Structure formats: structure tokens, C-alpha cells
Amino acid sequence: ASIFRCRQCGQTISRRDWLLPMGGDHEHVVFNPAGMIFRVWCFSLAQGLRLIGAPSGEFSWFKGYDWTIALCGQCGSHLGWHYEGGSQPQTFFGLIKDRLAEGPA
Ligand SMILES: Nc1cccc2c1CN([C@H]1CCC(=O)NC1=O)C2=O
Ligand SMILES: [Zn+2]
Numbered sequence: 001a002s003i004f005r006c007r008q009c010g011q012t013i014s015r016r017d018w019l020l021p022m023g024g025d026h027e028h029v030v031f032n033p034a035g036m037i038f039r040v041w042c043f044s045l046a047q048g049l050r051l052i053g054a055p056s057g058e059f060s061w062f063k064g065y066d067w068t069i070a071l072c073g074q075c076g077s078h079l080g081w082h083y084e085g086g087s088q089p090q091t092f093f094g095l096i097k098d099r100l101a102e103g104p105a
Contacts, residue, residue, distance in 0.1 A: 003016075004101065010074075014043045014093070019042065026042050040080060051070055051071075054068065067083050
């Protein structure tokens with residue numbers, strides 16, 4: 001249980017060692033304007049994504065960060081968001097926990 005892969009195709013995405021306690025917890029539960037609930041795990045680092053378009057501050061769940069949609073680079077599954085433009089850290093990833101599969105290295 002040390003590597004996280006995309007659930008739909010297996011693409012390598014992150015590691016348990018890279019989880020990031022933002023404001024006290026790596027886990028944050030949030031809703032978007034369409035009412036969807038997301039269990040977001042915060043990671044300092046991720047790979048194998050494709051970040052779409054340019055950042056937006058609108059509706060941001062994390063104060064002072066702007067977001068871009070992060071898709072699985074391989075299969076295009078929406079995996080979460082990349083956050084940037086803030087402070088300590090300047091950037092991180094918010095990944096949707098049930099879209100990942102956890103497993104050995
Ligand atoms: N405006 C809009 C319309 C439909 C879906 C969604 C949004 C904005 N958003 C997310 C983007 C990431 C964030 O930090 N907060 C959100 O709310 C969505 O998942
Ligand atoms: Zn995938």
C-alpha cells in the first residue's frame with residue numbers, strides 16, 4: 001500500500017509518502033457549485049497527470065490558491081486539481097481519493 005495509481009487504467013500518480021497535511025489533515029471534504037461531494041487527499045507531489053488550461057481562483061476550496069483541472073495523463077479520468085499561486089507551499093495537488101487505487105511499489 002505505498003503507491004497510488006489511477007483506478008481506471010493504472011497510471012502511476014502518487015505515493016503515500018507524499019501526502020500533505022494542509023491545515024491539519026491530508027483529507028478535506030468539499031462540494032462544488034454542482035453539489036458534488038469530493039473526499040480530497042492533499043499531496044505535495046504527483047505525476048502522470050495532465051493539467052488542463054490555465055489557473056482560476058474562482059470557487060477555490062483552499063484560501064490563496066488557484067486551481068487547474070488535473071486529468072489522468074493516460075486515460076483522461078478526472079483525478080482532482082493542481083493548486084498554485086499560494087504560500088507554504090506555493091503549489092500542491094488535491095486528488096479525489098476514490099479515483100485512485102493504492103498498492104505496493
Ligand atoms: N465552477 C464549477 C462548475 C462545475 C464544477 C466545478 C466548478 C468549480 N469546481 C472546483 C474546482 C476546484 C475547487 O477548488 N473548487 C471547486 O469548486 C468544480 O468541481
Ligand atoms: Zn487513468
